[PDB]
Amino acid sequence: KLKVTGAGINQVVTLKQDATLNDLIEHINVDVKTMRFGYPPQRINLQQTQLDELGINSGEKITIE
Amino acid sequence: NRPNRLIVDEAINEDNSVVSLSQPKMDELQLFRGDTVLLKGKKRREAVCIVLSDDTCSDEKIRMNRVVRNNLRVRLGDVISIQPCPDVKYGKRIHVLPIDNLFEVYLKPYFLEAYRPIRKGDIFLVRGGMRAVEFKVVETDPSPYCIVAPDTVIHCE
C-alpha cells in the first residue's frame, strides 16, 4: 500500500511486496514527471530499482507532479 | 477514546512542520507517513502539518513542538483532533512579517526543498545567524494555507 497524490489523482495503490519503480509508474494511470517522498524529503525526476531500495515502504505517501 | 482525538505531547524533532503518531495509531486512522494533516485545537485554531510515525510515541498521544502548540493555543496534555487535509495547493505567494537580511539568512534556507505547509496567521521560529527569529504569516495565496514550493514568491516586510 502506497498513497499517491498529485497530477490530478488521489489513490491508494497496492502492489508487490518486492516491487519496482516501473511497476509503480505503471499502476498510476497518468504521465508522471516527478516523485517526492520520505523524511527529510527526497526528490526523483522521471523524465528501474526495487521500491525497497530507495527507502519507500508500505503505509507511506508519494507526491507526484 | 475517539481514535482521532489525541493527547498533545512533547516533540523530539524540532521541525515546525511535523507532528508524530505511533504506527499503530496511524494504521487505525488510515494515515500515510508524509501525508498532510489538518489539526484542530482551541477555538477555531487550526494548523496544517506533515504526519510522521514514531515508535516511541503512545498510541493515544501526538508529538507536536512548541511552535505548533502555540499556533493551536494548546498545552501539553490538551486534546486535539487530527484529520487528513484533503488538498493543499502549492503557494504562489506568501507575505510574512518579522516579529521582535531575513530572506537569505532565515526564510530561504527554512523553506528551500522542504515543501512546508503554512497557514495564514501562523507564527513560526526560524534558527540561523546569531538569534532565532519569529515570523508571522500575514497572508498566503491560495488562502488560508498552501505548500511553500521552490517557485512560491516570498514577500517579507
Side-chain angles (χ1 to χ4, degrees):
Chain A
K1 281 161 204 171
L2 291 178
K3 177 167 151 178
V4 181
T5 309
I9 77 157
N10 190 356
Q11 191 53 279
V12 189
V13 156
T14 320
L15 56 107
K16 217 121 233 127
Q17 318 177 53
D18 289 345
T20 183
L21 179 71
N22 268 287
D23 276 317
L24 176 67
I25 320 180
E26 194 46 56
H27 261 53
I28 297 162
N29 186 39
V30 118
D31 178 44
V32 186
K33 303 210 158 127
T34 68
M35 295 188 318
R36 200 210 330 140
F37 63 91
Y39 186 80
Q42 42 202 318
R43 215 153 188 272
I44 294 298
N45 239 74
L46 305 187
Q47 301 127 99
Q48 177 111 351
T49 292
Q50 293 177 335
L51 294 180
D52 160 73
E53 312 237 316
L54 228 326
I56 304 188
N57 283 358
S58 189
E60 183 160 320
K61 192 250 204 202
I62 312 295
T63 305
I64 65 178
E65 305 159 348
Chain B
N1 270 266
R2 326 83 176 51
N4 91 322
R5 292 244 313 162
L6 306 181
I7 296 161
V8 167
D9 195 20
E10 184 63 277
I12 299 157
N13 185 349
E14 276 305 321
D15 189 338
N16 286 341
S17 305
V18 172
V19 295
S20 307
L21 302 184
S22 72
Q23 186 68 61
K25 173 60 66 183
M26 288 189 69
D27 289 339
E28 169 184 18
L29 289 178
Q30 304 179 262
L31 292 175
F32 293 82
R33 304 192 297 286
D35 228 346
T36 292
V37 300
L38 180 51
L39 310 144
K40 290 158 164 188
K42 244 61 142 202
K43 96 204 357 255
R44 335 191 279 275
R45 293 282 184 187
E46 286 186 347
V48 172
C49 288
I50 299 300
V51 56
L52 304 182
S53 62
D54 177 350
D55 290 325
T56 78
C57 169
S58 313
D59 302 325
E60 347 81 64
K61 293 179 186 180
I62 175 165
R63 286 209 197 281
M64 69 169 54
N65 83 343
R66 201 177 183 201
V67 162
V68 177
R69 287 194 315 265
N70 290 344
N71 285 328
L72 281 39
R73 305 296 204 254
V74 289
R75 278 140 85 135
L76 293 171
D78 293 335
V79 182
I80 245 53
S81 322
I82 181 147
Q83 72 207 57
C85 201
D87 289 345
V88 178
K89 304 275 167 16
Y90 287 0
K92 274 92 131 304
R93 185 180 166 78
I94 72 174
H95 184 337
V96 301
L97 148 78
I99 287 159
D100 303 76
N101 78 98
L102 307 175
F103 189 71
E104 284 296 329
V105 179
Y106 299 101
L107 290 167
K108 179 194 200 169
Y110 184 70
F111 292 119
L112 186 53
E113 278 160 329
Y115 293 87
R116 292 185 185 281
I118 216 168
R119 182 181 162 105
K120 168 174 196 180
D122 285 349
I123 282 152
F124 66 92
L125 185 66
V126 188
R127 299 203 140 82
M130 309 315 291
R131 0 216 77 80
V133 170
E134 285 189 318
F135 295 83
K136 192 172 171 85
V137 182
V138 316
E139 198 46 88
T140 68
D141 178 20
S143 193
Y145 39 69
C146 61
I147 295 316
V148 184
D151 62 342
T152 296
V153 175
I154 302 312
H155 174 58
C156 184
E157 317 206 3

